[PDB]
């Protein structure tokens, strides 16, 4: 026999370790076959200037196409013949490259990764070949309402800030982008301490630490002169951006109220809140009996196609809200239920309801961690986000302090009397007037 709590405390702790330059080493052991080693660099889109707005994202197309040591397709051939997978993901705050690989393959794994980060053989040919590709990706991203809309959100809740730029970047910055510019970018932002070398699975921390090729370090200050925040707050703005295209079959709406940085007691309590509203799709098997009202109403009244609440967490900024796709004629009704669910939440939460969401949270936050890749990303990202802690067993505790009154008071900071960030890609003809969505965040009636 064994009980949830117990299991919790029994989980392999994460070992954080440092090289001389600030290279961060972490790892969670299991003595299992496969391993996912990763280098989680934290110089994202938000450091880009208007020109290099898509810089980083451009580097990512070159990351895997050559090192001075390993030319044209020498990287791929190497990974492949091992049976290892190599992925590169980029965010507005975090770039990361990782490898999935047999545990015995660390040797040439970690070498590869390291190599990748540092030496990237980038010829004029590869630059002009990537351009064309990027320009073609851009065109394809315009084919995705959800991606089109979420960008919009950011741009309008971040209007007038570095953070509001697409990670994909400006069309024509791809055309223009000087070859010299990727260098300065990399050179200036890939310098650890930023970087973290993380990993999970069957490895021994001891060896990870050692294996780390100590080749280049943080060429930066020893004092406060550096302390000028490169992470300077980004002004919060509640505006809407309404891009109406009656040509399109459905309507995407992303509505948000600015939120806490990555670390904050209010930041877990929020989650528990969204557990309650939940998320819903044409294909949920419960429909009408699902315990979250927006879902039930939706399910019942054919109100919407799909809807999800989110919590986007940045160091100085946060996007909170949900997002619903709904026929041209149902934009207002779903707005009404949603906002309605928010207000009800900060005034009438009931312990039952908050206790169910609570438990949902736990699961969402345990199940994610199933698999090697998962764990690795939590460990890597966790270190630039929340610093060098791994709050995994704490969570249950913190999640445990949750009370219906805690949930209520935390939700009221952020939603109540606050000014929304709303964007849509019409049929938005029926989308509520900004003032109407505004007055939706306080309770006279409705």
């Amino acid at each position: 026999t064994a009980t949830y709590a117990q299991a919790l405390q029994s989980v392999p702790e994460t070992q954080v370790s440092q090289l001389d330059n600030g290279l961060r080493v972490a790892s969670e052991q299991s003595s299992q076959p496969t391993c996912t080693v990763g280098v989680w660099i934290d110089a994202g889109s938000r450091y880009e200037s208007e020109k290099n707005n898509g810089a980083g994202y451009f580097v990512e197309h070159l990351a895997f196409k050559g090192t001075k040591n390993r030319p044209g397709n020498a990287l791929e051939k190497e990974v492949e013949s091992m049976g290892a997978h190599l992925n590169a993901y980029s965010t507005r705050e975090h770039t990361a490259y990782y490898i999935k690989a047999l545990s015995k393959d660390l040797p040439k794994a970690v070498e590869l990764l390291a190599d990748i980060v540092q030496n990237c053989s980038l010829e004029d040919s590869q630059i002009e070949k990537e351009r064309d590709v990027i320009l073609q990706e851009l065109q394809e991203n315009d084919t995705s309402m959800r991606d089109v809309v979420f960008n919009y959100l950011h741009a309008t809740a971040f209007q007038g800030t570095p953070l509001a730029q697409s990670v994909e970047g400006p069309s024509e910055n791809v055309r223009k982008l000087s070859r010299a510019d990727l260098t300065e970018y990399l050179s200036r932002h890939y310098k650890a301490p930023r970087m973290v070398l993380a990993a999970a699975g069957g490895l021994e921390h001891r060896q990870l630490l050692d294996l780390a090729q100590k080749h280049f370090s943080g060429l930066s200050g020893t004092y406060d002169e550096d302390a000028v925040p490169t992470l300077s707050p980004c002004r919060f703005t509640g505006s809407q951006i309404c891009h109406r295209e009656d040509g399109l079959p459905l309507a995407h709406v992303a509505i948000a109220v600015e939120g806490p940085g990555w670390a904050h007691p209010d930041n877990v309590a929020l989650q528990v809140a969204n557990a309650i509203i939940g998320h819903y799709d044409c294909t949920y098997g419960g429909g009408a009996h699902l315990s979250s009202p927006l879902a039930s109403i939706a399910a019942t009244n054919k109100l919407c196609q799909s809807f999800q609440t989110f919590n986007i967490c940045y160091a100085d900024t946060g996007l909170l809200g949900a997002h619903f796709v709904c026929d041209h004629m149902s934009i207002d009704d779903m707005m009404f239920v949603l906002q309605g669910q928010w207000m009800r939440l900060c005034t009438s939460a009931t312990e039952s309801e908050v206790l169910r969401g609570k438990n949902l949270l736990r699961n969402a936050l345990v199940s994610h961690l199933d698999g090697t890749t998962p764990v690795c990303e939590d460990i890597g990202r966790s270190l630039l986000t929340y610093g060098r802690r791994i709050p995994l067993a704490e969570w249950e505790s913190r999640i445990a302090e949750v009370d219906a009154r805690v949930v209520r008071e935390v939700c009221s900071k952020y939603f109540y009397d606050q000014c929304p960030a709303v964007a849509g890609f019409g049929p938005i003809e029926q989308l509520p007037d900004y003032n109407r969505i505004r007055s939706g965040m306080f309770w006279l009636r409705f």
Binding site: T347, S348, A349, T350, R408
Partner: peptide, 22 residues
């Protein structure tokens, strides 16, 4: 829940209203 404290300030408003207004 919040209804008592809200019903109590709604209570008060009516009262002060009458009192004054009347």
């Amino acid at each position: 829940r919040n209804w008592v404290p809200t019903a109590q300030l709604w209570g008060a408003v009516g009262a002060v209203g009458l009192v004054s207004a009347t």
